Amino acid sequence: ALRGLDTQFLQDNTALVQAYRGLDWSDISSLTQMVDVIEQTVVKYGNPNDSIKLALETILWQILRKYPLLFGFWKRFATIEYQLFGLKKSIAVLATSVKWFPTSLELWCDYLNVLCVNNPNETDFIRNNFEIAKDLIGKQFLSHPFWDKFIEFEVGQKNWHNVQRIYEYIIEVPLHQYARFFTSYKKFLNEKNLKTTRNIDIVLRKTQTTVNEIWQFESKIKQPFFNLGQVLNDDLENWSRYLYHENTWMMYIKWLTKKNISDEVVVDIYQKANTFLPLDFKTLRYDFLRFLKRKYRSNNTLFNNIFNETVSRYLKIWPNDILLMTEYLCMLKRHSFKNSLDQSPKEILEKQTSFTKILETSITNYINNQIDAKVHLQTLINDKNLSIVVVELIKTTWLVLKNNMQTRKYFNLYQKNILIKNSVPFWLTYYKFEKSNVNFTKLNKFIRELGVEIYLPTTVMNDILTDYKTFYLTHSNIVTYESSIIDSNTFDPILYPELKMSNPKYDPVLNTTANVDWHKKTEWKEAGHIGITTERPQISNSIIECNSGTLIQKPISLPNFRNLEKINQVKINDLYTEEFLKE
């Protein structure tokens, strides 16, 4: 994780290549190895990328230099420096040259050509095509830049109206009108670019980030959805991200839908924004799952396969989260079958019975330690997420097939399994099944065994006991009730749930030996003060229970003490210090 150390490792391996003076083809391949390793952790700034690009160019490996520039560009879109580099290189190419260099200029132009400081890209492009003979392509580039609000746009206008000694203003009207639009927009934007330029300052501070003025800019490019909108809003978001406030991307999520830009432009943002924004934040992540289910309305198998892969990336980064496996198994039921009740009755039941037989043999392999790369469910099935996969088997078998005896058989097998004895959704489905099939005999045994062995959380433990009380009072009668209190144990479905409400380990235990073993328990020792197991002194044969009318018969026996030495001995097992501060 030490980003600072991989920087220092790079700078010293780099300086021992440079100051042992050789290639050190060792020290070269070690610098390239640590630069690959750090890149694969960490998104790198355009200064890091530029130094790497510089060195590979200096040891000249043209095709690998092209691949490294590709990588460079995909972590941090205001890399107009790295585009400009990539364009000066590729202009030393060969025979696909002419159209390769046109390609990276055209791609750089669509990523950075609308940025207030993007003029050097347009100038670079123009230089190249003028260094051909290409008067029509040069004029098209002039005309394009003139219709965008760019910093020295006025100087560029002047330049094109002396350079075009050849046909200057063939249509005076159109070019000077789109320039006039341009310079209106550059004046509007000039307020915001100046409120950016007049804090943007490395102070280890929010002026460095200019985050407040970036938020102001983003808002005023969203609201002004002036069609150059679609590209302007993405450009301002990336220029803001380059100085990791995730609400900037979570404001951009809303703008694309309101503006109405196509599914190809929108999905490539969130695919990129998931990798760009840090792990563990999880706000643009879960929204993107909601988008893919919503964009499925226009049925695309493209949209299916984005969802199957976004889960498989999120499941590895967040393995404990159960929401993901519920969303995945939904789409697996949905996009694999798609019945819609316009079929034969015998056809649809096979589509569910296949969904049983696939799901049944999927869990049997995640418990016997067997992975099948064909079935995509086996790559995702996790011991945190194995529960709900078992649940939906039970939920399909009981509701869809109307099959009880197979359902009840499946409870007995999966009750004793260690991964799913302690599961919220398993037992509540057992609760919902045992509620519907009316019986209380099986259901009373559920709740009396709820703190003792079937270990749910205390917020759910109240949830059954509050609900089961209301249900028992509503559906049962006294004759049902009176036979259920056998009175070996004091258990009663009316009164027991109120007593066992917030207490998990409440036990109705009547005994006379509880009187005998008293004074040696931790409740007695840590009495008025909790945690601290002191040994309180006391008189063994206390007179204070007996009345003064009954004492006068025989004389009072002297006081037998106990534990009288430990009046000052106070012991504490400092469980915080020795297991957290000491590890």
Partner: protein, 132 residues
């Protein structure tokens, strides 16, 4: 099936129906409504369909139809009935119950109504969306 005619008795149900009629002020409506679902049999579903879930449509009070907790409970009354097979239970809900909602209410009802569909009916999740 020896089911004690619980919340369904002329003495209590009229107290409940008088409670439901207040609609906006009595302030414990849906919690009372959610416990009317709990019958899970042939006779009692046909009762609670006709005697509350049909009459609430016929009178057509505005408050109850915009609250998606109502439509969610009306679906769960039908789906968990032991009398129906899967076919008619998938029919009776999707063919008749889903269309009886208004298109203006389908804004605020959809969130609670999707959650029933997203969990029990993944197969017919598309036919939900096109309707609204």
């Amino acid at each position: 099936d020896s089911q004690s005619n619980g919340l369904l008795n002329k003495e209590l149900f009229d107290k409940v129906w008088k409670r439901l009629s207040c609609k906006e002020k009595k302030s414990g409506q849906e919690i009372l409504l959610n416990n009317l679902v709990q019958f899970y049999s042939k006779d009692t579903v046909e009762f609670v369909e006709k005697n509350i879930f049909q009459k609430i449509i016929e009178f057509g009070w505005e408050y109850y139809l915009q609250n998606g907790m109502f439509w969610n409970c009306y679906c769960r009354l039908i789906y968990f009935d032991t009398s129906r097979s899967y076919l008619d239970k998938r029919q009776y809900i999707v063919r008749k119950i889903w269309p009886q909602i208004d298109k203006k209410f389908a804004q605020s009802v959809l969130p609670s109504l999707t959650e029933f569909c997203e969990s029990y009916f993944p197969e017919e999740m598309d036919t939900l969306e096109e309707m609204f």
